[PDB]
Amino acid sequence: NPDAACLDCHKPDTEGMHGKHASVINPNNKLPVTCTNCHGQPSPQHREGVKDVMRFNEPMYKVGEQNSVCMSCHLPEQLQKAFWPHDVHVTKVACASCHSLHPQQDTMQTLSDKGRIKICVDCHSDQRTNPNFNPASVPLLK
């Protein structure tokens, strides 16, 4: 129900949440995860493109602003146990430069051992050769 408001304008397939987050409970309130739990709240000026809702892997907001939303639910201690490189990136690159949360599957969860090293090379190399590199908005892995 809460998400119905957003989906009055936004496309229910591509702008609908169809990844793992579609089926999980918000640990903070024990209710299903909703759009505002990640994006916050539209203002009356929403259609004009203003700093109302959070935007992930785009240049509007700083890495820290984007990533901190994730940490309203996730625990950095647990991210370390899942995959070591998390800690060094929490303040340094947008979480959604790697993860894709809206599609039916998140490509990070299915990478080969080889692929899970190639992402490091690809992005760190780009940082060395791309004068326009922006850690808030990285299209490379997409």
Q: Specify binding-site residues for heme.
A: 6, 9-10, 35, 38-39, 70, 73-74, 95, 98-99, 120, 123-124
Q: Map the footprint of ligand HEC across residues 84-113, applying CB under 6 A.
A: 85-86, 88-90, 92-93, 95-102, 106, 108-109, 111
Task: Determine which residue in the list 72, 80, 125, 130 makes contact with ligand HEC, applying CB under 6 A.
Answer: 72
**Residue 133 and residue 58: Cα distance in Å, rounded?**
12
Residues 17, 101 contacting (CB under 8 angstroms): yes
Residue ranges of the annotated binding site are: 6, 9-10, 35, 38-39, 70, 73-74, 95, 98-99, 120, 123-124
Please name the residues in contact with 26: beta carbons below 8 A apart, sequence gap of 6 or more. Answer: 32, 33, 34, 37, 73
Task: Determine which residue in the list 31, 51, 62, 83 makes contact with ligand HEC, applying CB under 6 A.
Answer: 83
Q: Does 46 bind ligand HEC (CB under 6 A)?
A: yes
Q: Does 79 bind ligand HEC (CB under 6 A)?
A: yes
Say how many Å lie between the first and final Cα of the chain, rounded: 31
Q: Does 137 bind ligand HEC (CB under 6 A)?
A: no
Q: Does 118 bind ligand HEC (CB under 6 A)?
A: no
Shortest distance (Å) from residue 94 CB to ligand HEC: 7
Q: Does 136 bind ligand HEC (CB under 6 A)?
A: no
Shortest distance (Å) from residue 132 CB to ligand HEC: 13
